[PDB]
Curated annotation (Swiss-Prot):
Organism: Homo sapiens (Human)
This protein's domain notes: The AF-2 (activation function-2) motif is required for recruiting coregulators containing LXXLL motifs such as NCOA1 and NCOA2.
Function text: Nuclear receptor that binds DNA as a monomer to ROR response elements (RORE) containing a single core motif half-site 5'-AGGTCA-3' preceded by a short A-T-rich sequence. Key regulator of cellular differentiation, immunity, peripheral circadian rhythm as well as lipid, steroid, xenobiotics and glucose metabolism. Considered to have intrinsic transcriptional activity, have some natural ligands like oxysterols that act as agonists (25-hydroxycholesterol) or inverse agonists (7-oxygenated sterols), enhancing or repressing the transcriptional activity, respectively.
Subunit-structure text: Interacts (via AF-2 motif) with the coactivator NCOA2 (via LXXLL motif). Interacts with the corepressor NCOR1. Interacts with CRY1. Interacts (via AF-2 motif) with the coactivators NCOA1 and PPARGC1A (via LXXLL motif). Interacts (via AF-2 motif) with PROX1. Interacts with FOXP3. Interacts with NR0B2.
Domain NR LBD, chain residue ranges per copy: 5-243
Tissues expressing this chain: Isoform 1 is widely expressed in many tissues, including liver and adipose, and highly expressed in skeletal muscle. Isoform 2 is primarily expressed in immature thymocytes.
Protein's recorded name: Nuclear receptor ROR-gamma
Amino acid sequence: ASLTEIEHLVQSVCKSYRETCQLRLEDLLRQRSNIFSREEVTGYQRKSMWEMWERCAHHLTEAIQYVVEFAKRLSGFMELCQNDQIVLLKAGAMEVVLVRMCRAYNADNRTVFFEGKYGGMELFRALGCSELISSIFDFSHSLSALHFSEDEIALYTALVLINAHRPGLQEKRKVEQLQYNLELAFHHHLCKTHRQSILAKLPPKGKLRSLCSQHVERLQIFQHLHPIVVQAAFPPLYKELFSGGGEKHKILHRLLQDS
Ligand SMILES: O=S(=O)(c1cccc(C(F)(F)F)c1)N1CCc2ccc(OCc3c(Cl)cncc3Cl)cc21
C-alpha cells in the first residue's frame, strides 16, 4: 500500500495485541518474586500424568481463546474466507501462544509463570515430556535475549499468524499481500525504533513448527495411554487443533461467526 497506510498497520496491530492480552505484562514482572516452593513443586510433581495434562491443555485452550480474538481483530484477517481464517489459526495459534510465553518467562531464574506463581521446568515433570518442556524454556529463553517490546511482540505474532505459505490456503495471494503489508509494518517500526538489527536474531522459521510438532507428537503418545481422558476431560478446541480425530466438533468457526 502506502507509507501512511503502513503507519497505522503498526497502530492497528499494536492496539489489537494490547487489547487481546490475557497476560498483562506489568502483572507478570510484579510476580517473579512469588516463586513456587519445593513443597508446592513436589505437589505438582506427584500429580497423576493425565491430571497435569488435563490442567495444561485447559490452560493452553484459555491462551488460544485470546489468540483467536487477536486474529479476529487483525485488520485484513476477517476479510478472508472461513477456510483460510481457520487454517491460519489451526497452524499458527499455538505458535503465537509460544511466542507470547516469552513474557511469562523470567530468564534470570529460568522460571515461567504458572497458576499464579513462578516455577521452573521441573514443575512439569509429571507430564512425561521433559524433552519438549525443556525446548519451550530454551525457546522463551532465546526470545528473552531479544528483549522484545510489546509493540515488537505485536507485529511479530501477527506475522507468525499471517503466513502465506501455510498448506491448505484456498486463496494464497490474499494472504501474501496481507503478509507483505504486515511485513513492512514490522520492518518500518524496527527501522523507526532503531532495531533493524534484531531481524537476524529472530528464531529460524522452522523452530516454531518443530515445537508445535513435538506437542502433537507428545499428545499422540498420551492419547494412547489415556484415550478416554482426552474424549472426556480435554477441551474441544484443544482436540480440534491438535488431536486426531478431534475436529469432529468445530469450535473454531463458532468464534469466527459471532461478533
Ligand atoms: O499451562 S500454561 O499456563 C504453561 C505455562 C508455562 C509453561 C508451560 C509448559 F507446559 F510449556 F511448561 C505451560 N499454558 C499457557 C501457555 C501454554 C502452552 C502449552 C501448554 O501445554 C502444552 C503441553 C505441553 Cl508443552 C506438554 N504437555 C502437555 C501439554 Cl497440554 C500450556 C500452556
